[PDB]
Amino acid sequence: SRRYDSRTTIFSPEGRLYQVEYAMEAIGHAGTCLGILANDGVLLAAERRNIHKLLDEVFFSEKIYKLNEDMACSVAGITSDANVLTNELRLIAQRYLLQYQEPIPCEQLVTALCDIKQAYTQFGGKRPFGVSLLYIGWDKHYGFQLYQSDPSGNYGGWKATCIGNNSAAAVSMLKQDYKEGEMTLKSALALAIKVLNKTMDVSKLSAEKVEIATLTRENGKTVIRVLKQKEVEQLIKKHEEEEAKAEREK
Template sequence: MSRRYDSRTTIFSPEGRLYQVEYAMEAIGNAGSAIGILSKDGVVLVGEKKVTSKLLQTSTSTEKMYKIDDHVACAVAGIMSDANILINTARIQAQRYTFAYQEPMPVEQLVQSLCDTKQGYTQFGGLRPFGVSFLFAGWDKNYGFQLYMSDPSGNYSGWKAGAIGANNQAAQSMLKQDYKDEITREEAVQLALKVLSKTMDSTSLTSEKLELAEVFLSPTGNVKYQVCSPDVLSKLLVKFGVTQPAAETS
């Protein structure tokens, strides 16, 4: 039945659905998962890296985590070429705001501006929706630390903890059960790694298959975005009991 109504983005089905947007969401469901958790002293983002080849150089760049401005970062799930365009758009918007007003762009205003762009691709003919979802983590003077989730329709919402990508429903259920208010950043890292270890398709969790990033305030009061190195991530996996320490060879 849907075949009559899914040839264009702008055609509604009799049930009021836009199938092209739903297909884009299905594409995201096959991508590596990402989890974001809001804590009282920062925001934690953890993503699953899809290692396609051992020859791929992954140490020089990140696949799931991107810095948009000094106070905003994001985790990505979906088609990376689509994500790159939107991330560059968000970076330009953030810099234009800073240039005009001499202060960082409020996090929600930046998210809303990017989602307006995404919504336009669901409204006009000859375009297809962006096949990517985002988890935005940031801090501003108005609302402090914030976590937002957006999808291909251009919709966005604020969350205490959220998941996108593969097995996101299972991850969301676990987060709903285990999340507690006033959680610290270290506890948020532990919870995110625990949830991802149980929802990833891979049987063993290693630092090569994960990316961990945090947005927090430094002792001087500046917003800091930090990506965890593979060595530190391996130690965290062992510390929180997600993986067993490697056996020493004599």
């Protein structure tokens, strides 16, 4: 019985460990998600993958998952492993609300899940999750927040990050076009359609190929709005009008 054990927990002789690096190797391919904020509001831009002509296009979202009443997440990686995590921190936020009668702060929801994710990399002889995912949300302590999880179990706060297939190309351009605290929730939308114009090799930016959801703070609402397919393409062509203007005049 010890001949068949694969030892998914031990170190390697060079010091690092192989199992989560194979998972973060798989997190590169198969998906593209990004977020941005500088002011009132925060967005999640995600690219759809299965664009076959025979699907029902239901469940209000594809890679966006509403977690709390004022925060949501975008996921990347193995989709079946994602469904277990998404309905796991969904009731971490509810057992907080049962205990304190107050909505959960957005940061310590991430730390609670990233401790469950860390435990499989550390004992049990168990396959870790090949899932990395984003976090938007609002709380009264710091306002609009943006986090990023990794399959190793370590998180981080950010301002704009992509976990796509060409995510290094996206990050290299996000730190080429940015402004700290002045990107309103229209310039960020124009910047969002600019970034996934680059990283998507399928050109011309099909409006059914991407999904965009915004979280804006209305007084006691915190409206999480998945914007429909009638206002994507007018935002698509708005990027197209200015690029023919800027190329010809230069």
